[PDB]
Amino acid sequence: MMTNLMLLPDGMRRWSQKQGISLDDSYAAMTDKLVEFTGWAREEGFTTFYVTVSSVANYSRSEEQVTTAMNAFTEVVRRCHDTLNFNYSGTLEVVPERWLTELEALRAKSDSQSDFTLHFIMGMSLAHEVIGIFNKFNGKIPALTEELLAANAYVPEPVDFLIRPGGHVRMSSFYPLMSPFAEMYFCPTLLNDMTRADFDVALEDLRERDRRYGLYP
Amino acid sequence: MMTNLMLLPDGMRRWSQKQGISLDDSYAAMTDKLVEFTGWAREEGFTTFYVTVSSVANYSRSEEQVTTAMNAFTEVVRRCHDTLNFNYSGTLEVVPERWLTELEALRAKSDSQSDFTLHFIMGMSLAHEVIGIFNKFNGKIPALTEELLAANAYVPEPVDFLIRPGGHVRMSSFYPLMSPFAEMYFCPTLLNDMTRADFDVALEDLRERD
Ligand code: DMA
Ligand SMILES: [Mg+2]
Numbered sequence A: 001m002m003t004n005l006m007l008l009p010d011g012m013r014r015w016s017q018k019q020g021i022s023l024d025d026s027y028a029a030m031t032d033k034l035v036e037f038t039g040w041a042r043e044e045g046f047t048t049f050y051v052t053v054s055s056v057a058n059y060s061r062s063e064e065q066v067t068t069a070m071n072a073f074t075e076v077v078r079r080c081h082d083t084l085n086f087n088y089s090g091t092l093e094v095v096p097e098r099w100l101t102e103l104e105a106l107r108a109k110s111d112s113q114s115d116f117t118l119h120f121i122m123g124m125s126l127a128h129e130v131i132g133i134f135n136k137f138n139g140k141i142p143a144l145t146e147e148l149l150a151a152n153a154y155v156p157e158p159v160d161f162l163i164r165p166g167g168h169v170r171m172s173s174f175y176p177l178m179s180p181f182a183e184m185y186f187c188p189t190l191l192n193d194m195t196r197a198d199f200d201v202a203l204e205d206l207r208e209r210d211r212r213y214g215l216y217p
Numbered sequence B: 001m002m003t004n005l006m007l008l009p010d011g012m013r014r015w016s017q018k019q020g021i022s023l024d025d026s027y028a029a030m031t032d033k034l035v036e037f038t039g040w041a042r043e044e045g046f047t048t049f050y051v052t053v054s055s056v057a058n059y060s061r062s063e064e065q066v067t068t069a070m071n072a073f074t075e076v077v078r079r080c081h082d083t084l085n086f087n088y089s090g091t092l093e094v095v096p097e098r099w100l101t102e103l104e105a106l107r108a109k110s111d112s113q114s115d116f117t118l119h120f121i122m123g124m125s126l127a128h129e130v131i132g133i134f135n136k137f138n139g140k141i142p143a144l145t146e147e148l149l150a151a152n153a154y155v156p157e158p159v160d161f162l163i164r165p166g167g168h169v170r171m172s173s174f175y176p177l178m179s180p181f182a183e184m185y186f187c188p189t190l191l192n193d194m195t196r197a198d199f200d201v202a203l204e205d206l207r208e209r210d
């Protein structure tokens, strides 16, 4: 009876406007909050904490905004990587190589023996994900199987719980390919305003639901 | 100019328990409600109304429950096929042959000149969808393009709005692959209890975002 958790960070610009601070300061608050959230997820017994770092669309922002966001996410790993297992995946060719180099070094220095994993997905987009898998195996296998697809999806297992703060009730580019029965929870609170109580109430909601997987009781 | 709506019907068993009626009677109420819903969607100017008939997982329900559901959904098309354009897609190899034959005949008899389309998706499952597309194009093209993928996905265009009644906030194998910018709306009302007002306020919510 092991569970994992996925978070869709949202609301950093609106939080900067709400607090009257720079976007840099809002992303610094995001780094702090994501370290908190990672600790909460571990305390609650989740085996992997997935964070959807970015969509492919995000990389059409300016280089300055891309560098600000990517540095803020990477700093989370800089701070916590020593005590957990870190991994990452996604449409890596759209991520500026500097962050891939640093995140690879952080993955190498993480505790691969840890029972808790922090997992970043970058450049999420189902179209890009599917095209990447196709192009990888095109003409090299007789047929695609469920095992191969599952072993090459960005998210390497089905996701149990998914939380999206920030007030948007939509999945954007972030729906996990191999999670047909993931439970979704949306809340209006901006990520940088989320408290441990907000997380706990989300968990009450998510854990109370009857999961039927398309079948009757 | 396209504007579409996807509905995930849910809550028929619970409604049968709420009303103290058989599952068959609850699914008959579902047929009536889905004909209503199709009319509402048409009145609201949607060009295609997508209805998720079944997941691959649903076809591991009992044969009786499968037959009850599939007959109720097909009865929707039996009633509406003459006045709209009907189409369907999905993992067709998991749908029992009886329903595929009848639905194919109804697709053939539907009004292809209509400016409104009712589109059933059956056997929804992202894994099965992707495997089917791969196996179709494997070794036959230099690379998969966004255009080819879009042209072979179960849902043939991006979905604007998605509505799931019945109180569960999950996609249950029904997520539309090529709709990264779809807006979602969930409500606790069981499908068979949804009024036109419930639909209207759902549309206010969806239309107010963008
Ligand atoms: C056809 C349709 C939209 C069914 C509703 O989903 P479900 O009851 O099969 O899924 P779950 O078991 O996750 O509630
Ligand atoms: Mg946003």
Ligand SMILES: [Mg+2]
Pocket: B010, B011, B012
């Ligand atoms: Mg159901």
